[PDB]
Amino acid sequence: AEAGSRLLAPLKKPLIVSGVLQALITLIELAPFVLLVELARLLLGGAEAERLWTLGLTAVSLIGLGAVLAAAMTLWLARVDARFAHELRGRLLTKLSRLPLGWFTRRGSASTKQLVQDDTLALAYLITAAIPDAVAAVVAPVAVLVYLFVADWRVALVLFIPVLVYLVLMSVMTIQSGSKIAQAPRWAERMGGEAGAFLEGQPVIRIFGGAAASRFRRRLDDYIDFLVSWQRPFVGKKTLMDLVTRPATFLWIILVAGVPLVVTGRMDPVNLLPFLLLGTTFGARLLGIGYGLSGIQTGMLAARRIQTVLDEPELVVRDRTRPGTVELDRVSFEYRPGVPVIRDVTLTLRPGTVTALVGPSGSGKSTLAALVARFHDVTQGAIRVDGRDIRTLTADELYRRVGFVLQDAQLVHGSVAENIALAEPDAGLERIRTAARDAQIHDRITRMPDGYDSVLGAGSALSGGERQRVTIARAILADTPVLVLDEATAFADPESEYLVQQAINRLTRDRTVLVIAHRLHTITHADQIVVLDDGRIVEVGTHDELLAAGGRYRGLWDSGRY
Amino acid sequence: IRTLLRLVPAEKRGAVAGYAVLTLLSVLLRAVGAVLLIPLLAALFSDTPSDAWLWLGWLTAVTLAGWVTDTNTARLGFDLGFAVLSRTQHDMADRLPNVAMSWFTPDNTATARQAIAATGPELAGLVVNLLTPLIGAALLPAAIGVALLFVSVPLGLAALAGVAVLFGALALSGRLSRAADKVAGETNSAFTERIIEFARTQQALRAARRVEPARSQVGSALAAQHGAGLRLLTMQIPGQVLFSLAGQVALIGFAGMAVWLTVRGQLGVPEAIALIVVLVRYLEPFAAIADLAPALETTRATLNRIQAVLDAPTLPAGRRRLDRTGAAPSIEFDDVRFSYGDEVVLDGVSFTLRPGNTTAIVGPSGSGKTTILSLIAGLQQPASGRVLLDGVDVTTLDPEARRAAVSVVFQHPYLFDGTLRDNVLVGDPEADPDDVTAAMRLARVDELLDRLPDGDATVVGEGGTALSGGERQRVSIARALLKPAPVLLVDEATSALDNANEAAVVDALTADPRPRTRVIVAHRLASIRHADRVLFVEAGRVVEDGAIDELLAAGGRFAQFWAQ
Numbered sequence A: 001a002e003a004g005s006r007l008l009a010p011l012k013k014p015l016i017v018s019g020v021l022q023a024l025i026t027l028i029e030l031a032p033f034v035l036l037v038e039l040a041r042l043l044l045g046g047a048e049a050e051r052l053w054t055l056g057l058t059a060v061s062l063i064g065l066g067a068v069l070a071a072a073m074t075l076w077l078a079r080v081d082a083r084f085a086h087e088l089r090g091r092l093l094t095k096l097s098r099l100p101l102g103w104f105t106r107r108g109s110a111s112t113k114q115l116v117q118d119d120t121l122a123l124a125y126l127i128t129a130a131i132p133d134a135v136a137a138v139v140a141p142v143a144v145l146v147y148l149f150v151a152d153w154r155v156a157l158v159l160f161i162p163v164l165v166y167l168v169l170m171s172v173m174t175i176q177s178g179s180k181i182a183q184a185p186r187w188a189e190r191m192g193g194e195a196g197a198f199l200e201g202q203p204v205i206r207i208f209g210g211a212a213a214s215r216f217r218r219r220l221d222d223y224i225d226f227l228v229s230w231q232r233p234f235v236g237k238k239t240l241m242d243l244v245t246r247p248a249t250f251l252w253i254i255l256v257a258g259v260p261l262v263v264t265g266r267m268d269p270v271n272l273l274p275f276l277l278l279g280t281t282f283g284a285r286l287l288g289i290g291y292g293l294s295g296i297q298t299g300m301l302a303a304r305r306i307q308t309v310l311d312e313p314e315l316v317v318r319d320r321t322r323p324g325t326v327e328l329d330r331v332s333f334e335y336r337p338g339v340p341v342i343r344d345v346t347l348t349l350r351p352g353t354v355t356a357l358v359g360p361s362g363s364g365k366s367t368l369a370a371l372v373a374r375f376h377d378v379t380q381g382a383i384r385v386d387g388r389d390i391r392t393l394t395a396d397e398l399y400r401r402v403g404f405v406l407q408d409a410q411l412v413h414g415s416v417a418e419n420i421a422l423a424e425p426d427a428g429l430e431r432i433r434t435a436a437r438d439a440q441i442h443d444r445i446t447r448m449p450d451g452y453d454s455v456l457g458a459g460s461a462l463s464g465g466e467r468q469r470v471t472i473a474r475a476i477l478a479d480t481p482v483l484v485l486d487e488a489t490a491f492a493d494p495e496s497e498y499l500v501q502q503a504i505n506r507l508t509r510d511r512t513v514l515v516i517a518h519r520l521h522t523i524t525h526a527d528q529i530v531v532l533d534d535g536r537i538v539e540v541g542t543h544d545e546l547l548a549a550g551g552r553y554r555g556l557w558d559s560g561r562y
Numbered sequence B: 001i002r003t004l005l006r007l008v009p010a011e012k013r014g015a016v017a018g019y020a021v022l023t024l025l026s027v028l029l030r031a032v033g034a035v036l037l038i039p040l041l042a043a044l045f046s047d048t049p050s051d052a053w054l055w056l057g058w059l060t061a062v063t064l065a066g067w068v069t070d071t072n073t074a075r076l077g078f079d080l081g082f083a084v085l086s087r088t089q090h091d092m093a094d095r096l097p098n099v100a101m102s103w104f105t106p107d108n109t110a111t112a113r114q115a116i117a118a119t120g121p122e123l124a125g126l127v128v129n130l131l132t133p134l135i136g137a138a139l140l141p142a143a144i145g146v147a148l149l150f151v152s153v154p155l156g157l158a159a160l161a162g163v164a165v166l167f168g169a170l171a172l173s174g175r176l177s178r179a180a181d182k183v184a185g186e187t188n189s190a191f192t193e194r195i196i197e198f199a200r201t202q203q204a205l206r207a208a209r210r211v212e213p214a215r216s217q218v219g220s221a222l223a224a225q226h227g228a229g230l231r232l233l234t235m236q237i238p239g240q241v242l243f244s245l246a247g248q249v250a251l252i253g254f255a256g257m258a259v260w261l262t263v264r265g266q267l268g269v270p271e272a273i274a275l276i277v278v279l280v281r282y283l284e285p286f287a288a289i290a291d292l293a294p295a296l297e298t299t300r301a302t303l304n305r306i307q308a309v310l311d312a313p314t315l316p317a318g319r320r321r322l323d324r325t326g327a328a329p330s331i332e333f334d335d336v337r338f339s340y341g342d343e344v345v346l347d348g349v350s351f352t353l354r355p356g357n358t359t360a361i362v363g364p365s366g367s368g369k370t371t372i373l374s375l376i377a378g379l380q381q382p383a384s385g386r387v388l389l390d391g392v393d394v395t396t397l398d399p400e401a402r403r404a405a406v407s408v409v410f411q412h413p414y415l416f417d418g419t420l421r422d423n424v425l426v427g428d429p430e431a432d433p434d435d436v437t438a439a440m441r442l443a444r445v446d447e448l449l450d451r452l453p454d455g456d457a458t459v460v461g462e463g464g465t466a467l468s469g470g471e472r473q474r475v476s477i478a479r480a481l482l483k484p485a486p487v488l489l490v491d492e493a494t495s496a497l498d499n500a501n502e503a504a505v506v507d508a509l510t511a512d513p514r515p516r517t518r519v520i521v522a523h524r525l526a527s528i529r530h531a532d533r534v535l536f537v538e539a540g541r542v543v544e545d546g547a548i549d550e551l552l553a554a555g556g557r558f559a560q561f562w563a564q
Ligand SMILES: Nc1ncnc2c1ncn2[C@@H]1O[C@H](COP(=O)(O)OP(=O)(O)OP(=O)(O)O)[C@@H](O)[C@H]1O
Pocket: A105, A335, A341, A360, A361, A362, A363, A364, A365, A366, A367, A368, A518, B452, B465, B466, B467, B468, B469, B470, B471, B496, B497
């Protein structure tokens, strides 16, 4: 696989070495039994004791050596994998830091967690044990069988029977479960998604449908029914391969083919010694690769899924190459092709000017804010901040220039300070309190048990209005030239909303501001009100001008009084 | 293992015994098959090789009976693994909607996600892949030792001495690596939870520049996860060394006692040669236990997560039912008190709702409005006090009747990933399309159908991420109105809707033709239109209440609320 070989390029030489080292290790592990065979022949021959001692002690030591080398190689080779997984998880987290946010929304958090963690973990067999096992399964059977072939062909051809039956069992198992292997990661993502929504959307399930009617449980049964159909013929074949390749099955079939030869005048019982000592040894080598073929398949698919993300379009920072000025020129955008969401918008935001972007729900106003932050790339036209194209700015320069509040008060699992100080984690507690006091949430944080260290994990410590005031506290502390407020104070009561807006006016009296709000009476004082209806600028002007115009804004304003 | 016999179904306890009987029988047949080479080769090398047939026939009978036993214990282990998988998963799926909301801490939510995430083939193949070979390898050296007492008692005792060394090494290897294996699991769990936060909170992180692995919390978790991962690889070195010493110590003991007996004539030469092969069979479980020992600690953690979910504290319930399914109940609070941990939200709120009328609740942010609705809907339960539906305590009510007696509009409208219609039909899946279309029309979701390209087939994303803030709010309102339950709870339906859509939704919340007792948690004075009664809630208690005109005339806290 090119998508996999391109990913496992860095480990070319660790893998080639592991292939060679396992070739020597299995030969070292088969060496004691060649000596123990020689010890056995001389016992029948009654040779001198010191010769037997030498073969005995060398064989026991070579067992110790082989176990030490095989153990040591598995320590190194496991550590090499842990270093590649750490690096590769680093590359993924760096890539996903650059992709447009369309990648995340259409995919979900369950699929990303599978990508970063479970797909990289799926490579563990492909690096740590796939090439060791492949070489071990090739040389140890070939070395054993060829040596046993010289010893006696009659019992040797009978050893093919467990081998060929095993090959047919693994081929039939592989082709049968191959389709299920492809469907497996998608099923894991879907149930990863359903498990996540089941836990996150608990208040919904507790009222609308309950446990039995939940779509999680209906998918859960379907997943288990997929697992049973996948795992019954798979585990059913796995144990058949275990039975066929066991030492007892080799030892029994050797005796069945040897004992009749021993009883008749056709084979001496001394020539049985190689088979009974070595013939039972190579089953576990074949059994390792047979159980590993599925591990390779999940590994190669996981590599293909990882590399497919690592060549995704990256939202590049091109080298093409007034302060606080944001200009939208002929900007059009489409979340997916064929539907226009924004249609040739042209708008200019200047320092010290509060701009209100209002309109019908679904008209595209939050999408414009997302384009200014460059979560997505405009399909036409250009956006430039302080006269420089956003596609030419780097993320640090871009996000140092603009600050954002995004209408979805997402809070990260950490202290309130680790959420208020998200923009500047090194910022001191004196700034963090000052941001919160200006966002009008310090009174709430003081009453918490841990104070400013209280954790904000899953569904904890804050209500909807309080989650937003943390997010406004975060945006204040970032302290950027431009500020973008996406339905800030939507959940804030009028007493708190006035205090927060007064703070923002105080802080951003000489800063570019873009207020987005459905409540039109809260943007009565914007120097320009931009009306966005169905992805186009239908009218622009002050509050009074738009009321006199008798257009969309007059209708929305009149409809507000109910 | 001890926890798996608790999670196993009570139905399958008959099948468990059949597993235990057959797995022991296979161990005996494998040991007897190994030890049957001693008299077989002793008779094969003698002056009369024809006596080898008797032991070969016994060998064939023992090994074929192995295949029947090992195939049957594999089918039984497959069933028991999947019976445990289906049973434990369905019990977690049934219990989790009944677990108290306080149980969902960030750590416990990770535990539930991890426990639910164990549905994959790894937990299903628990018995076949771990316990069957673990029990086989743990007992086969002991069985081979006991089987050698028929050949020579001192040699059988030597093998049992090597068995004691094995179980000692097995006990010690788990003891050394357990401290590091716990930390590896903790760091890996935190890394998972931070990837999920990383993908869910991409907007906020990117604006705050905490997205790159050098500065991101997921990047730090990857560093800690890597540090604990490598530490575990190193701290498992004693386990591998100790098994290797045990395998070598047993080799010396078994081989020493074989040569001490052989030189003294108690064992012939062919018995000693056969004992080389029996030694090899006897030594294989030493290495296999080393391969299976790491998996034992992960599986112990996995079953501990599942058992943690199943032991979670379910909500109190009874078996009562309302007098009438569809009639409007009367909601009332009687000194209801509630608290999230140490913080107290309600200090004995007491009110009564007449059946069929519409009442409104307003107050400052963080006052307790969504707490009051959650107590009405049964999501929470009081620390003390009662919430009565039609005079019937919620605590004593049947879960099915309690669930069916309320439909709510949540403050933060969560939609499940899937089409738009699926989220609407969740309110009442059995409803005919005429009721579904009426539900959408009332919520102004019909406008979405016109504007959006796929209409009602619009694939919402995770949550309501692939929809506008107001669009997902309208889908949520349609879901709530579709449910025919006689109580309707509204929690900030006006937050994310423009002035035109807000007026249509507010009108339709009261214009719904079914009779219901409505509780409205609104934001604006115009959002509480057509409200029979209004309750002002502040600092966890209903400080003031009355009609809109009456409270406005009184000029109390209600009037001061709108004055800013
Ligand atoms: N991530 C997304 N994927 C697909 N479609 C989207 C996505 N986000 C928004 N849309 C669609 O784009 C159009 C406008 O979305 P947008 O979020 O810009 O709305 P809005 O005007 O900001 O809404 P509101 O005022 O309700 O917050 C709607 O059709 C919405 O369904």
